[PDB]
């Protein structure tokens, strides 16, 4: 079996996760499930970014130890992934020894190699962004005798603080030409490629400054073994999760050798710089292969901009699932919000997706079909014979073309296009009923064969849609197979879509049709 390794960002458990976090984790889940159905040996990693002042200050404010705070927050996150039915193969916490020990080895190795040297970081820092800023990067900067003496982060808009402490530096500047050479040789590395140029212009052109990779002013993080008063910079700590979770630097590196390098790192656009500059340079310094692709999706937006945990301008996925069901929540996120751009959430757009696409187009397609099979054939769906109706040959071709087009969208992580292409077919299947007017055929017994043929095409079309939706919807496909009494597990797999009309034996469909949705 060919291997496929996909990761989400490990999220800061600094508050309740929102549909932004759900998008990343569902998107990763869809690709994992898709890749498993394609016959790949899949590992899907998610986790939590638990070190740094951002978390430590949240714990102290809550009046709790960092670890009690974190266990309570991680509990909330793991409840959400369970409810969203995320098929992640592992959950990595940066507070785990399997992670901390790898971060220790990596730092000690880069110190020994001389990539890391002791200095002092004197400059601006955003605790909420866990990001170093130059004075020119600050928004609403404050001037005093012609000097910038304060300002806000350009990312979060939180006030930055002045840092002046002993710090270990990683000489990332000497890897600049090698990184630019890598981009020249691998121009498809960031997807979509429209994110690459802004990142090079913003972060490499001005000159790769040496990265402050340790702190002495607080103690919540991995301690530098050779200099324990130093704590590893949360972003060095965090990035290592992708290889630490595979048992890199452990006795048995079988998981590492099998799944590294990662096929896809998922993220939103704001942390591309960490995954596209610092991460590849760190991997160069450790002499490890680079990730194959960074897939950076857009932001889910509200009326007041990017949906943000710290801001509070949020939509809780727990509310959406409890109120409208899981299928509607997963469908909305993947369909309404194209991967390669930003998208505004509205409750109106959510209910329209939920009611018109799921309940009406798909839900009513299944109900119409089973109702007619029960009415005309007393529940005995006649076996597929061939394209007996003059519309069938062309529709059977559309079924195959839907699978082909769907595949092309899925391989480029164009989830919204894959789903749009499936719904074009679901719409055409509904239109097949309107065109064939099977109620007219039910009159004479001379048309009983053709009526059977129409029923067999409706059901095979539904089966195609159900199989293609298995990565996206975890409830609807199983419910559809149950109600149609399709029990062959092979007829739920991608290979069964290779030739139209697999149901060549008669089937008793459910005598008690229930709504597929919610």
Return residues touching ligand TPA (CB under 6 A). Answer: 9-12, 49, 238-239, 241, 271, 274
**Pairing state of beta strands 190-191 and 293-297?**
parallel
Q: Work out the burial of residue 513: count CB atoms within 10 Å of its CB; fewer than 13 is exposed, 13-18 middle, 19 or more buried.
A: middle
User: Which residue is associated with the tokens 């509200």?
Assistant: 302
Which one, 196 or 306, has the nearer CB to ligand ATP? Answer: 306
Q: How far is CA 243 from the centre of its chain?
A: 19
Q: Contact 473/330 with Cβ under 8 angstroms?
A: yes
**Which of these ranges, 305-313, 445-453, 455-463, 481-489, lies near ligand ATP under the rule CB under 6 A?**
305-313
Tally of CB atoms within 10 A around 260:
19
Q: Dmax over Cα atoms in the chain, in whole Å?
A: 97
Q: In this structure, are residues 475 and 514 in contact, taking their beta carbons and an 8 Å threshold? A: no
Contact of 203 with 273, CB cutoff 8 Å: yes
Is residue 223 exposed (0-12), middle (13-18) or buried (19+ Cβ within 10 Å)? middle
Q: Which of 4, 5, 6, 21 binds ligand ATP (CB under 6 A)?
A: 21
CB 54 within 8 A of CB 130: yes
For residue 94, the tally of other CB atoms under 10 A from its CB is 25
Told to check if 307 binds ligand ATP by CB under 6 A, we report yes
128 binds ligand ATP (CB under 6 A): yes
Distance CA 181, CA 168 (A): 27
Pick from 265, 306, 330, 463: which binds ligand ATP (CB under 6 A)? Answer: 306
Out of 176, 250, 310, 420, the residue judged to bind ligand ATP by CB under 6 A? 310
SS3 annotation, 130-151: CEEECHHHCEEEEEECCEEEEE
**Closer by beta carbon to ligand TPA, 272 or else 451:** 272
Asked if 396 and 501 touch (Cβ cutoff 8 Å), the reply is yes
Q: Which residue has 């009415």 as its token pair?
A: 375
The annotation places the binding site at 309
Kindly tell me which residue out of 5, 6, 7, 9 binds ligand ATP, with binding defined by CB under 6 A.
Answer: 9
Name the residue nearer to ligand TPA (CB basis): 234 or 365: 234
Token code pair at residue 449 = 């064969």
| Beta carbon nearer to ligand TPA, 270 or 493 | 270
Q: Which one of ligand TPA, ligand ATP, none interacts with residue 238, CB within 5 to 8 A by kind?
A: ligand TPA
**Which of the ranges 14-22, 180-188, 424-432, 441-449 carries the binding residues for ligand ATP, by CB under 6 A?**
14-22
Q: How far is the CB of 296 from ligand ATP (least distance, A)?
A: 8
Q: Which does 10 bind (CB under 5 to 8 A by kind): ligand TPA, ligand ATP, none?
A: ligand TPA
Among 4, 5, 11, 34, binds ligand ATP (CB under 6 A): 11
**Contact with ligand ATP (CB under 6 A) among 7, 14, 46, 95:** 14
Q: Is 334 in the site for ligand ATP (CB under 6 A)?
A: no
| Residue 456 CB partners (closer than 8 Å, separation 6+) | 381, 382, 383, 384, 385, 501, 503
- Decide: helix, strand or coil at residue 181: helix
- Residue number, 280 or 382, with CB nearest to ligand ATP: 280
Residues 245-274 binding ligand ATP (CB under 6 A) are 267-268, 271
Residue 109's SS3 state is helix
Q: Which residues belong to the annotated binding site for ATP?
A: 309
Nearest distance from C-beta of residue 305 to ligand ATP, angstroms: 9
**CB 128 to ligand ATP: min, Å:** 6
Find the helix packing angle between 415-436 and 392-411, rounded to 10°. Answer: 170
Nearer to ligand ATP by C-beta: 309 or 353? 309
Instruction: Give which of ligand ATP, ligand TPA, none residue 310 binds (C-beta under 5 to 8 Å, depending on kind).
Output: ligand ATP
State the minimum distance, in angstroms, from the CB of residue 279 to ligand TPA: 8
46 near ligand ATP, rule: CB under 6 A: no
- DSSP class of residue 359 equals I
- Say which entry of ligand ATP, ligand TPA, none residue 214 contacts (CB below 5 to 8 A, set by partner kind): none
Q: Closest separation between CB of residue 12 and ligand TPA, Å?
A: 6
| Letter string b/e over residues 366-393, b meaning 16 or more CB atoms within 10 A of that residue's CB | bbbbbebbbebbeeebbebeebebeebe
Question: Does residue 12 touch ligand ATP according to CB under 6 A?
Answer: yes
Shortest Å, Cβ 43 to ligand ATP: 18
Distance CA 44, CA 46 (A): 7
Structure tokens at 482: 């149950």
CB-nearest residue to ligand TPA? 9
Which stretches of the chain bind ligand ATP, using CB under 6 A?
9, 11-12, 14, 20-21, 23-24, 128, 156, 267-268, 271, 299-300, 306-310
């Amino acid at each position: 079996k060919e291997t496929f390794y996909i990761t989400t960002p490990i999220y800061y458990p600094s508050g309740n996760l929102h549909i932004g976090h759900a998008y990343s984790t569902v998107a990763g889940d869809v690709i994992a499930r898709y890749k498993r159905m394609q016959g790949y040996d899949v590992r899907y990693l998610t986790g939590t970014d638990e070190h740094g002042q951002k978390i430590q200050e949240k714990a102290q404010k809550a009046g709790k130890t960092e670890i009690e705070y974190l266990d309570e927050m991680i509990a909330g996150i793991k409840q959400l992934w369970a409810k969203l039915e995320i098929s992640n193969d592992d959950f990595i916490r940066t507070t785990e020894e399997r992670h901390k020990h790898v971060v220790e080895q990596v730092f000690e190795r880069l110190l020994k190699q001389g990539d890391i040297y002791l200095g002092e970081y004197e400059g601006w820092y955003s605790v909420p962004d866990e990001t170093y800023y130059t004075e020119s990067q600050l928004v609403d900067p404050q001037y005093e005798n012609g000097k910038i003496i304060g300002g806000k982060s350009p990312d979060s808009g939180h006030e930055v603080e002045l840092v002046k402490e002993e710090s270990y530096f990683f000489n990332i500047s000497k890897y600049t030409d090698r990184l630019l050479e890598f981009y020249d040789q691998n121009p498809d590395f960031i997807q979509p490629p429209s994110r690459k140029n802004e990142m090079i212009n913003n972060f490499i052109k001005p000159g790769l400054a040496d990265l402050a990779v340790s702190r002495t002013s607080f103690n919540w993080g991995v301690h530098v073994p050779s200099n324990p008063k130093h704590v590893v910079y949360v972003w060095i700590d965090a990035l290592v999760n992708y290889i630490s979770a595979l048992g890199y630097l452990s006795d048995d590196e079988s998981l590492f050798n099998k799944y590294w390098p990662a096929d896809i790192h998922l993220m939103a656009k704001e942390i591309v710089r960490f995954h596209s500059i610092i991460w590849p340079i760190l991997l160069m310094a450790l002499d490890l292969p680079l990730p194959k692709k960074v897939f950076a999706h857009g932001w889910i937006l509200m009326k007041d901009g990017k949906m943000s945990k710290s801001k509070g301008n949020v939509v809780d996925p727990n509310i959406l699932i409890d109120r409208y069901g899981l299928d509607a929540t997963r469908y909305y996120l993947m369909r309404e919000l194209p991967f390669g751009s930003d998208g505004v959430f509205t409750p109106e757009a959510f209910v329209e997706r939920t009611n018109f696409d799921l309940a009406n187009d798909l839900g009513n397609l299944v109900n119409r079909t089973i109702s007619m099979v029960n009415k005309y054939f007393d529940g005995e769906l006649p076996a597929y014979q061939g394209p007996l109706h003059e519309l069938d040959e062309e529709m059977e071709a559309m079924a195959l073309e839907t699978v082909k087009s769907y595949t092309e969208s899925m391989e480029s992580l164009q989830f919204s296009v894959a789903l749009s292409t499936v719904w074009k077919f679901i719409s055409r299947t509904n239109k097949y009923i309107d065109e064939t007017t099977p109620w007219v055929l039910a009159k004479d017994d001379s048309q009983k064969d053709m009526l059977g043929n129409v029923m067999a095409h409706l059901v095979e079309n539904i089966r195609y849609a159900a199989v293609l939706l298995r990565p996206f919807l975890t409830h609807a496909p199983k419910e559809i197979f149950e109600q149609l009494n399709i029990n062959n597990p092979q007829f739920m797999e991608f290979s069964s879509l290779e030739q139209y009309g697999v149901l060549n034996e008669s089937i008793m469909v459910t005598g008690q049709p229930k709504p597929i949705f919610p």
